[PDB]
């Protein structure tokens, strides 16, 4: 019902608990963190990470494929913790350089 999230980004990992019924940016902003976003609707890449251990739920976003999806790409907008989990942050050259 709370995971913990690792959130590994540019200059190091930082983690906090997350609910099951929030999205992974939404709390990470609770948090006091500064993650990148533009729409917060799952409909551009912008807030976009990678899943390195653990799964989410982002069934709630559209923009990936499943190509993408299957590398583990995840958008944090949208994505709901469904395990502990890792996600390395600002993957959005990554996903739109495929
Ligand atoms: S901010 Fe656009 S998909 Fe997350």
């Given at each position: ?23 992974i940016l939404?709390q990470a902003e609770?948090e006091?963190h500064?993650l ?63």
């Amino acid at each position: 019902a709370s995971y913990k999230v690792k959130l590994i980004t540019p200059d190091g990992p930082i983690e906090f608990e997350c609910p099951d019924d929030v999205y992974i940016l939404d709390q990470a902003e609770e948090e006091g963190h500064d993650l990148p976003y533009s729409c917060r609707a799952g409909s551009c890449s912008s807030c976009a990470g990678k899943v390195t251990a653990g799964t989410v739920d982002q069934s709630d976003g559209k923009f990936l494929d499943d190509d993408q999806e299957a590398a583990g790409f995840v958008l944090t907008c949208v994505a709901y913790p469904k395990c502990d989990v890792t996600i390395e942050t600002h993957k959005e050259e990554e996903l739109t350089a495929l």
